[PDB]
Design a protein around this ligand. Sequence first.
Ligand SMILES: [Cl-]
Length: 341
Amino acid sequence: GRSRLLEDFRNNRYPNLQLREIAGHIMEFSQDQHGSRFIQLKLERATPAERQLVFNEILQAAYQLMVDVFGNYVIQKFFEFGSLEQKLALAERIRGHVLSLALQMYGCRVIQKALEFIPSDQQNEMVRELDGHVLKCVKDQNGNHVVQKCIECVQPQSLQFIIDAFKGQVFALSTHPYGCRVIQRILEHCLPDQTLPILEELHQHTEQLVQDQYGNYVIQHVLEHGRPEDKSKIVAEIRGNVLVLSQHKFASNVVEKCVTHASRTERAVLIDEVCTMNDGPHSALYTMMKDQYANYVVQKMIDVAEPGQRKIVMHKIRPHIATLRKYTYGKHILAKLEKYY
RNA sequence: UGUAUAUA
Ligand SMILES: [Cl-]
């Protein structure tokens, strides 16, 4: 099965083996773990002629290397360190196979690398091959990384068909484990005509989303990178629910990003909400202090409060200082206190 | 004291 040169290579009998010595043997070495490593090592620092000898033998059977557990790294190197003509010729071997490669455990790493290094002409052809399988790729554990890469690498206008597919389905995909990744990328790289409709669906489902295992991340993303108009829509959704959302394992993270990224006014209003409104005998603030998640909100509020409003939080906390000690999460508030005493 | 992405 393995050629003598390969076995003898494996068997450690050529510590001085050079690329030129494995002529006629690239495909075999490429599909072998040590051989493949050998080839990669030698490539990052090989003369264009050496790199060309190696290419000549992988071009025809390229696809086979792209879907190989060991060969995919060799292809990838040519996409990184190869030549403009070499990258274009592999781009051709890929044509008509973008879909099946992007759903492939190993192939999809090659599609990702190709998208980073080819011209927009070839990018746009690759993308177009996904026309009609947007949700299939987004839900696939291989495919979704290709869709994220497209979004990061290709002109936003070539991605309009991905948008068309997310339309009406944004809530579904934001609570999905891969889809929430793609939604975020669209928010970062897509055009106003594109992020607009998506932002609308997001605002429509903020209540559910902030509480969702994956959805909260999309809401936090908007808070950290979005337009003030969008940040405020979200903040308004937290208003009046600060206490409850803070005690939630997922929503409490979004509450923090609210306190942190909200306008001066909106921040003061949120902090005041739990200073003022009561939760039974003592205020919302006190209940939050004792809670496994809420105590993190308290501390972050202490962090970003204007010096004047920090005074008010401190005064509300102060009467309980001695009793906080007796609570698992209150203790941690005492910690943040020292910083400011 | 608290939540998310993949190959040797
Ligand atoms: Cl031989």
